[PDB]
Design a protein around this ligand. Structure first.
Ligand SMILES: O=c1ccn([C@@H]2O[C@H](COP(=O)(O)OP(=O)(O)O)[C@@H](O)[C@H]2O)c(=O)[nH]1
Ligand SMILES: OC[C@H]1O[C@@H](O)[C@H](O)[C@@H](O)[C@H]1O
Ligand SMILES: [Mn+2]
Length: 275
């Protein structure tokens, strides 16, 4: 049950004036595509805080990539779901190399040791997540938050537009093109090319996605075939056949060194760290 929002004073939306004219802000299956200027974060914050939303954030830091955790976590503290309950799950082969990062109130971190693709299996921890968080967000570690990433992304299932391909025609997408792989997508299929570095949803829908991608990867392995972009090729096959209920714009996954700062991006929120 959702209780009533309180009175709020904010600018009136006007139906004969679009927030954004330069970009597609809703997909053809009526999922919002999240760009700056499309949401009033005060409305969304009230909605999700009235549900006492808890967001889990999964990150893998194996072998050398433990070096990225300090900046990743410190900038998450400044920008990710601030004011909401957050549980970080750091999966690593070196628990002792996880940096001591100071966290704001209502936020926790758990270190999960693993052995040094396999993110999908490791994500699909199933019972722990169901008991502890409402949404899971699954991101790459070699990244930093530079601006707000909050509850506007939460929905039962989301993917993020790959920053090299958002202006591309589908035939240019680097989907798996061999019919012998479970990730195969023909040249006349595809809505978007999603990046495997940032996806999420409710814990139920993220367990469905990571179970189906892990099953499809095992089939490929049995058949002696490895998809061109690994779990990313499987995530793209999944999201073509199970449409996401929101799509994040490339504000949410950018590489300023490679791609600069185009005008269509009003904010660069989560970016690659030089490596
Ligand atoms: O030796 C490795 C290689 C990969 N990763 C994890 O797998 C993610 C995806 O790999 P990577 O960032 O290298 O892919 P890229 O973005 O360069 O294509 C990394 O962010 C880490 O979270 C890791 O922890 N250790
Ligand atoms: O073509 C797909 C690839 O595009 C690259 O730019 C990216 O570094 C890879 O991880 C993969 O997403
Ligand atoms: Mn990466």
């Amino acid at each position: 049950f959702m209780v009533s929002l309180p009175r709020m004073v904010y600018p009136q939306p006007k139906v004969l004036t679009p927030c954004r004219k330069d970009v597609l802000v809703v997909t053809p299956w009526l999922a919002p595509i999240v760009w700056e200027g499309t949401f009033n974060i005060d409305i969304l914050n009230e909605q999700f805080r009235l549900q006492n939303t808890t967001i889990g954030l999964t990150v893998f830091a194996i072998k050398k990539y433990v070096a990225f955790l300090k900046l990743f976590l410190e900038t998450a503290e400044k920008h990710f779901m601030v004011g909401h309950r957050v549980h970080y799950y750091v999966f690593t082969d070196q628990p002792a190399a996880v940096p001591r990062v100071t966290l704001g109130t209502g936020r926790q971190l758990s270190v999960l040791e693993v052995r040094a693709m396999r993110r999908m299996e490791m994500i699909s921890c199933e019972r722990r997540f169901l008991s502890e968080v409402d949404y899971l967000v699954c991101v790459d570690v070699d990244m930093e938050f530079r601006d707000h990433v909050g509850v506007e992304i939460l929905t039962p299932l989301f993917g993020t537009l790959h920053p090299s391909f958002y202006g591309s025609s589908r035939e240019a997408f680097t989907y798996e093109r061999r019919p012998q792989s479970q990730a195969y997508i023909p040249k006349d299929e595809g809505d978007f090319y999603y990046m495997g570095a940032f996806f999420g949803g409710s814990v139920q829908e993220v367990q469905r996605l990571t179970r189906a991608c892990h099953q499809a990867m095992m089939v490929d392995q049995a058949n002696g075939i490895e998809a061109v972009w690994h779990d990313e090729s499987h995530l793209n096959k999944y999201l073509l056949r199970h449409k996401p209920t929101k799509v994040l714009s490339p504000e949410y996954l950018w590489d300023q060194q490679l791609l600069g700062w185009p005008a269509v991006l009003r904010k660069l929120r989560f970016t690659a760290v030089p490596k």
